[PDB]
Amino acid sequence: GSGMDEIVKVLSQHDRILVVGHIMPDGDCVSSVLSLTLGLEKLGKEVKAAVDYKIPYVFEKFPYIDKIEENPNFDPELLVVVDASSPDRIGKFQDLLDKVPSVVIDHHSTNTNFGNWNWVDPSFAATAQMIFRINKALGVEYDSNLATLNYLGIATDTGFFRHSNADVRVFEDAYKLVKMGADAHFVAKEILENKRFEQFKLFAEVLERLQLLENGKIAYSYIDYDTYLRHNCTDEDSAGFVGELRSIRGVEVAVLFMEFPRGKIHVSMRSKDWFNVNEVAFELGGGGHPRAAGVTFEGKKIEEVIPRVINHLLKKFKEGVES
């Protein structure tokens, strides 16, 4: 629909701007929201940042993290929606879409182009890369704090330069930002080395319960609610567990069953090279992306949800192995 130049001109034409990110905010969301907000503020615009969700604790030390609001009181001329592929993903702020002109900036190919202006380019690994280019086009001078905030999303959305999307442009952007003072160590420490001690004792139980299925192609484990309690943990402590189980040699699908609170079992699935876990997840009542999906069961017994999910996963997997 629109290109960066059109977005830059729209941003220049408006002064009271609300920058909105997607719910359940990750590094790229926080990075893209704050990097654009601060850039626009440096231009003298009246800007507020909003995400309809609690900002996770791992961001607590980041400069200007306080600028992201859950309940802003603001009368914007322009809504800028970043890193969100559809209106439901910005929560209660979608109710502004028919009241305020909107810009969309996103790297998700599934983006519905729900804005009055839409710059969507999936060749970027992170929306933060697109914000970096917008700020440059606007003449934003980066300091170390803004460089760190813009580096954040490029790091997290590439798995810290490990995913298949970490191409030359990603590494060029990272080099440029570190040269401007981005604190790569700070970012990694706060995002990746911020685990409660109790999470490690919980993870030990996960690993003791770990089992492989179907020629070591499927790995699964489970956390019952009483095991969370025993280690003084919640589902906040176990978020990164399923991705670790995917790193087993030969495993194509990792599955983790997580009962928290009691009776509520969330099932996370991650795949590696080819298996579309979103299809299995959707058929079980959930959904997601081809390599990362999930499904929630409410008011059920974990010992009954595990067979239910594994039986269907195994059927779909063998069907996929065949043709």
User: Does 299 appear as a known binding residue?
Assistant: no
Q: What are 190's two structure tokens?
A: 């706060």
Size of the site for Ca ion (CB under 5 A): 2
207 binds a copy of itself (CB under 8 A): yes
Stretch that binds Ca ion, among 37-45, 176-184, 259-267, 272-280 (CB under 5 A): 37-45
**Partners of 103 in the β-ladder:** 80, 117
Return the number of other C-beta atoms located less than 10 Å from residue 88's C-beta.
12
Name which position in 178, 292, 306, 310 contacts a copy of itself (CB under 8 A): 178
Name which position in 9, 195, 230, 318 contacts a copy of itself (CB under 8 A): 195
By the 10 Å C-beta count (0-12 exposed, 13-18 middle, 19+ buried), 176 is classed as: middle
The answer to whether the beta carbons of residues 177 and 150 sit under 8 Å apart is yes
d(CA 155, CA 290): 21
**Partners of 271 in the β-ladder:** 253
216 binds a copy of itself (CB under 8 A): yes
Binding mask 60-89 for Mn ion (x = CB under 5 A): -----------------------x------
The answer to whether the beta carbons of residues 259 and 304 sit under 8 Å apart is no
26 binds Mn ion (CB under 5 A): yes
Closer of 15 and 121 to Mn ion (Cβ): 121
Q: Which of residues 222-261 bind a copy of itself (CB under 8 A)?
A: 245-249
Task: Quote the distance between the C-alpha of residue 175 and its chain's center.
Answer: 23
Q: What are 178's two structure tokens?
A: 């570190």
What does 9 bind: a copy of itself, Ca ion, Mn ion, none (CB cut-off 5 to 8 Å by kind)?
Answer: none
Q: Nearest Cα to 15, choosing from 51, 57, 47?
A: 47
Binding mask 140-169 for Mn ion (x = CB under 5 A): -----------------x------------
203 binds a copy of itself (CB under 8 A): yes
d(CA 84, CA 143): 27
Task: Quote the distance between the C-alpha of residue 201 and its chain's center.
Answer: 26
Interface with Mn ion (CB under 5 A): 26, 28-29, 83, 127, 157
Interface with a copy of itself (CB under 8 A): 155, 159-164, 166-168, 171-172, 174-175, 178-179, 184-185, 188-189, 192-197, 200-201, 203-204, 207-208, 210, 212, 216, 219, 245-249, 272-273
